[PDB]
Amino acid sequence: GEFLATTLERIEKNFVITDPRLPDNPIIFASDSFLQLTEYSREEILGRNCRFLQGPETDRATVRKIRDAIDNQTEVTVQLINYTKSGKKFWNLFHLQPMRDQKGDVQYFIGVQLDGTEHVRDAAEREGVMLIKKTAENIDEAAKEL
Ligand SMILES: Cc1cc2nc3c(=O)[nH]c(=O)nc-3n(C[C@H](O)[C@H](O)[C@H](O)COP(=O)(O)O)c2cc1C
Ligand SMILES: [Ca+2]
Ligand SMILES: [Cl-]
Structure with missing residues (x-):
């Protein structure tokens, strides 16, 4: 199809990168x-x-x-219900953070989604946040020179 995945888009995690310079931070x-x-x-x-x-x-x-x-250009971690194209619901343990350039200015936003079946607490929440924060750090490295 159109827009063959880049190497970064083949990283084996759910994430997106947005460019706030473009209309509607897409x-x-x-x-x-x-x-x-x-x-x-x-x-x-x-x-x-x-x-x-x-x-x-x-x-x-x-x-x-x-x-x-x-x-506020700051990180957040939340859980919310999201929907697939066909309307299937999933819980999303979601982490966002800005990516800064070598002047400290925000260049992109990174969002990482851990899909699940339920709102999580306690150990499942902790392990999920560990995973999405580590992933975000890895994408910060991966996206720095884009
Ligand atoms: C990098 C990035 C990733 C995002 N990923 C999600 C997501 O997984 N799920 C979601 O419901 N919103 C996500 N959002 C949030 C929406 O894009 C939007 O910021 C939010 O709905 C608030 O803005 P609005 O009030 O204009 O809709 C993401 C935003 C950014 C910048
Ligand atoms: Ca799931
Ligand atoms: Cl749980």
Whole structure:
């Protein structure tokens, strides 16, 4: 199909990279795993803001937490219900953080999704946050020279 995955998009994790310089802070990179999770083709989602993942049972207070982190240029970790292209629900243990350049300016945002079947707590929450934060750090390394 269109937009063959780059090497970075073949990293075996669900993530996207957005460019806040572009209209509506849209996706510019999306991993193959993210596409498999969400059922979209890459062409379908490039240039779009990630809010298409939200639907009727998505808690809007949790979306506001993400909105506020983006506008304060700071990280956040939350859990919220998201939807695939066909309307299948999944829980998303979600981590966002900015990627800074060598002047400390925000160049991209990185978002990492750990899909699950339930809201998690305790050990499953801790292990999931470990995984998505480590992944975000790895994508920070991977995306620094893009
Ligand atoms: C890098 C990045 C990744 C995002 N990933 C998700 C996601 O997995 N799920 C989601 O519901 N929102 C995600 N968002 C949040 C939305 O794109 C958007 O910021 C949120 O809906 C608040 O803005 P709005 O009020 O204009 O919709 C992501 C945002 C960014 C910048
Ligand atoms: Ca799942
Ligand atoms: Cl749990």
